[PDB]
Amino acid sequence: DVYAQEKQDFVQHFSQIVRVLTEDEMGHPEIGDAIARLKEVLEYNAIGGKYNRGLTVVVAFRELVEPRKQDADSLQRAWTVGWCVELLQAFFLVADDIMDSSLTRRGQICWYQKPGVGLDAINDANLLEACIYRLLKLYCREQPYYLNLIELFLQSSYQTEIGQTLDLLTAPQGNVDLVRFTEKRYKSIVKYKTAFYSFYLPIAAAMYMAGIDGEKEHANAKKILLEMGEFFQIQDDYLDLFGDPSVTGKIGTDIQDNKCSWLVVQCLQRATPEQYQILKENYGQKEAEKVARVKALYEELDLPAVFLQYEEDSYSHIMALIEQYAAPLPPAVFLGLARKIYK
Amino acid sequence: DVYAQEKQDFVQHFSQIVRVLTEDEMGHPEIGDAIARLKEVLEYNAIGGKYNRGLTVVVAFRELVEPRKQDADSLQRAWTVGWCVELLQAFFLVADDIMDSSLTRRGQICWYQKPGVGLDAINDANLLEACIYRLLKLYCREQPYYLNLIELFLQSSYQTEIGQTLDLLTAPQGNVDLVRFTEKRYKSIVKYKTAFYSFYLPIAAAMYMAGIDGEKEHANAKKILLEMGEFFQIQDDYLDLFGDPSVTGKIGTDIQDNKCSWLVVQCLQRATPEQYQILKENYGQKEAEKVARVKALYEELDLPAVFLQYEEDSYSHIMALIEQYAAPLPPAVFLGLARKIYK
Ligand SMILES: O=P(O)(O)C(O)(Cn1ccnc1)P(=O)(O)O
Ligand SMILES: O=P(O)(O)C(O)(Cn1ccnc1)P(=O)(O)O
Ligand SMILES: [Zn+2]
Ligand SMILES: [Zn+2]
Ligand SMILES: [Zn+2]
Ligand SMILES: [Zn+2]
Ligand SMILES: [Zn+2]
Ligand SMILES: [Zn+2]
């Protein structure tokens, strides 16, 4: 709702983002071809998603900053920082798709799978990251929260990369051991690989723009946001297998990639010794028939019902956390976010 | 000389860099496996080179900062920033080796070619980059030049990535057109992909630590340093084919990769129509025999003599630039650097 009434404004300002990231180098004709490539990278990879993470920055900003302080300049900066969060995302996702050997994202073929792109997409990804800091300097350098934002974005990237490292270490290709796939290990992975950048980052950014820089306030917001992020990633794992491809926009690879998925973790907690063997002999392999066998095992253990039940309980737990930790922040800030990810 | 008498101190402090990048997360046991991987990545990729770029930060710092200001804390920060420059390098080189499909670097197999690593090396690279900003905050946050350094390192990364984009765009695999390989195009590529981070970055960092933040001083230093960087990359292209592998530490790939090399550019300027055809039909292809044919064409046009002559003239041109632009900085600063890269 508040998102949907912020969305189209947010999307419309992507053109100025691309304009300014392209004309920032007008005085340097010799890099024209690189700048054109950057434009193409932006348009293929930063556009086409739902922009929920970036919109969260905008929504939270309007709810945290007093209206008489929300001038045209301040709003412009708010949706610039929103787009920076979308760029960070794009940076990680382009690399993630290479490393997960994925095929599609946002209903199109992954950038690196495009003929002519391939592993050059690695440098494309790094450029998207650099754009974040080009925008922060262009729009926010003179602001009191400038350094806070730079550090928030750098820290969030480090955390996410630690998370990705845990994700990849725990999922060695060609090497199946289910013993690694524990609940404790799972929660650590998704905290770092998803929860920080998808949920803490956007709200924290808006907070700093609102002059809310207190360690206590950020720790309290973080209590709620990291838990939401844990649920969001469990939902991402569920949908990787049971989601509707025309809705998700991407083909799942967790089983083939031998991932420490929430699904496989719950399977391990429930499987008989016989079922364990079936999982062991079919998981982490590229063969369609072996993947289908894993999915059948999941459905036979009613993991879809287990997920639906977990989602209800997670929702309740998170609402409890909001009651406890939202103050002094407007509860609407966390509620709007909760509404976006729960049904 | 001044490098060699700074070197072993510099190298010895890598252990503290690795210590502090590993114990910075003592309070977070759950990421132990990621931190161990980071250590392994650091030790395989930041160690084993000559450290000239990092040593330049240290050397320049000692020459720019008054001795009575060079306390134990300030020196420690100087070789921390030196190591940050080495980490930036490692970040770019790990990715560069994937994208150039290289085999060896620093006398060992490329990180990504190691069994068990592969394209996970992409995330490894990003972690090395993040380490830069972790160190800057840990050691320099309270310093007046803190933000100047953060921005210098981010800007240098952006420039280098623009350069890499130009390098890759100009070298489409399977698509040979020699018409793209001009002198004008070449100079632009190496300015951005090498000159900024290898020569401006280190000196600029030391300058900012010395409180030298003037736009005029940096532009003058940059006049000298970008020209040195252009020569250094031409030398890198020369050695890719005519260098001694046990000295260079890496196998060349420029011809196979269809690169806009200084060699191919000079060849194009000199080749008869018949030789042009020979180049056209053998360049940018993986076949050893076709590569050998290109090398023979280069030697037949005495490109090695052309390089040796160019190196002498470049040296003289750069010394002229130092006479003109070094002041108010100690000329030794640029001379020591020139001495390292010329013979
Ligand atoms: O399941 P992943 O963690 O790989 C994913 O959720 C991406 N991601 C990467 C880091 N955090 C999330 P995606 O399913 O979009 O490919
Ligand atoms: O020749 P490249 O530019 O690929 C190289 O010099 C690396 N590099 C990358 C950007 N600047 C320099 P290397 O020969 O070390 O592989
Ligand atoms: Zn993925
Ligand atoms: Zn992934
Ligand atoms: Zn997923
Ligand atoms: Zn290379
Ligand atoms: Zn290269
Ligand atoms: Zn080279």
- 3-class SS string, chain B: CCCHHHHHHHHHCHHHHHHHHHHCCCCCHHHHHHHHHHHHHHHHHCCCCCCHHHHHHHHHHHHHCCHHHCCHHHHHHHHHHHHHHHHHHHHHHHHHHHHCCCCEECCEECHHHCCCCHHHHHHHHHHHHHHHHHHHHHHHCCCCCHHHHHHHHHHHHHHHHHHHHHHHHCCCCCCCCHHHCCHHHHHHHHHHHHHHHHHHHHHHHHHHHCCCCCHHHHHHHHHHHHHHHHHHHHHHHHHHHHCCHHHHCCCCCCCCCCCCCHHHHHHHHHCCHHHHHHHHHHCCCCCHHHHHHHHHHHHHCCHHHHHHHHHHHHHHHHHHHHHHHCCCCCHHHHHHHHHHHCC
B137 is catalytic: no
Distance CA A14, CA B253 (A): 39
Q: Is B146 exposed, middle or buried (0-12, 13-18, 19+ CB in 10 A)?
A: middle
Q: How far apart are the first and last CA of chain A?
A: 14
Domain that holds residue A30: 1-343
Closest CA to B268 of B175, B164, B185: B185
Distance CA B74, CA B152 (A): 19
Amino acid at A52: N
Contact A322, A224 (CB under 8 A): yes
Three-state SS letters, A199-247: HHHHHHHHHHHCCCCCHHHHHHHHHHHHHHHHHHHHHHHHHHHHCCHHH
Amino acid at A316: S
Amino acid at A304: P
Query: What residues are paired with B136 via a beta bridge?
Result: none
Residue B92, CB-side half-sphere exposure with 13 Å CA sphere: 24
Assess whether the C-beta atom of A236 lies below 6 angstroms from ligand 1: yes
Query: What residues are paired with A105 via a beta bridge?
Result: A108
Distance CA A335, CA A74 (A): 24
Spatial neighbors of B93 by CB under 8 A, at least 6 apart, are B45, B105
Distance of CA B202 to the CA centre of its chain: 11
Contact B174, B101 (CB under 8 A): no
Region for residue A284 given its phi and psi (left: phi exceeds 0; alpha: psi -120 to 50; beta: otherwise): left
Q: How far is the CA of B235 from the centre of ligand 6 (A)?
A: 13
- How many domains, chain B? 1
Contact B66, B183 (CB under 8 A): no
Take residue B256 and report the two structure tokens written for it: 């196979």
Q: Reduce the DSSP state of residue A108 to 3 states and report it.
A: strand
Contact A172, A178 (CB under 8 A): no
Which of A45, A157, A168, A193 is the pocket-test mutation for ligand 1 (most atoms within 8 Å of CB)?
A193
Peptide bond into B328 cis (omega under 30): yes
Closest CA to A80 of A10, A153, A157: A10
What's the length of chain B? Answer: 343
Distance CA B324, CA B326 (A): 6
Take residue A280 and report the two structure tokens written for it: 């062991």
Spatial neighbors of A261 by CB under 8 A, at least 6 apart, are A237, A240, A241, A254, A255
Distance CA B278, CA B246 (A): 30
What CATH number did the domain enclosing A96 receive? 1.10.600.10
Region for residue B107 given its phi and psi (left: phi exceeds 0; alpha: psi -120 to 50; beta: otherwise): left
Pairing label, strands B104-105, A108-109: unpaired
Distance CA B302, CA B243 (A): 15
What angle do the packed helices B52-64 and B201-209 form, to 10 degrees? 30
- Main-chain dihedrals φ then ψ at residue B108, nearest 5 degrees: -120, 165
Helix (H) or strand (E) holding A100: none
Contact B140, B80 (CB under 8 A): yes
Assess whether the C-beta atom of A92 lies below 6 angstroms from ligand 1: yes
Helix (H) or strand (E) holding A343: none
Distance of CA A279 to the CA centre of its chain: 29
Take residue A157 and report the two structure tokens written for it: 């990237």
Take residue B112 and report the two structure tokens written for it: 């990504």
**Which ligand approaches the C-alpha of residue B91 most closely?**
2
Helix (H) or strand (E) holding A73: helix A72-99
Tokens 């940059």 locate to B222
Q: Which of A33, A102, A122 to mutate to test the interface with B (most CBs of B within 10 A)?
A: A122
Q: Reduce the DSSP state of residue A172 to 3 states and report it.
A: coil
What angle do the packed helices B72-99 and B14-23 form, to 10 degrees? 80
Closest CA to B21 of B49, B5, B43, B3: B43
Distance CA B260, CA B172 (A): 10
Annotated active-site residue in B61, B153, B231, B232: B232
The shortest C-alpha distance from B169 to chain A (Å) reads 8
Q: Would you list which residues of B are annotated within the binding site? A: 50, 53, 89, 96, 100, 105-106, 193-194, 233, 250, 259
Closest CA to B95 of A167, A124, A293: A124
Q: Reduce the DSSP state of residue A40 to 3 states and report it.
A: helix
Amino acid at A113: Q
Query: What residues are paired with B109 via a beta bridge?
Result: B104
Which whole-number Å values give the CA distances from B86 to A108, B91, B93, B191, B193, in the listed order? 38, 9, 10, 19, 16
Question: Any CB–CB contact under 8 A between A24 and chain B?
Answer: no
Contact B242, B203 (CB under 8 A): no
> A31 and B192: CB-CB below 8 Å?
yes
Distance CA A48, CA A25 (A): 26
| Count of Cβ atoms closer than 10 Å to residue B49 Cβ | 17
Q: How far is the CA of A57 from the centre of ligand 1 (A)?
A: 21
Spatial neighbors of B230 by CB under 8 A, at least 6 apart, are B187, B190, B191, B194, B195
Helix (H) or strand (E) holding A330: none
Report the nearest atom of ligand 2 relative to the CA of B259: 1
Residue nearest to atom 12 of ligand 1 (CA): A194
Chain A residues touching B133 at Cβ < 8 A? 151, 154, 158
Q: Reduce the DSSP state of residue A109 to 3 states and report it.
A: strand
Distance CA B106, CA B103 (A): 11
Amino acid at A62: R
Distance of CA B23 to the CA centre of its chain: 29
Distance CA A264, CA A254 (A): 9
Distance CA B81, CA B65 (A): 15
Take residue A43 and report the two structure tokens written for it: 């348009």
Closest CA to A263 of A285, A286, A239: A239
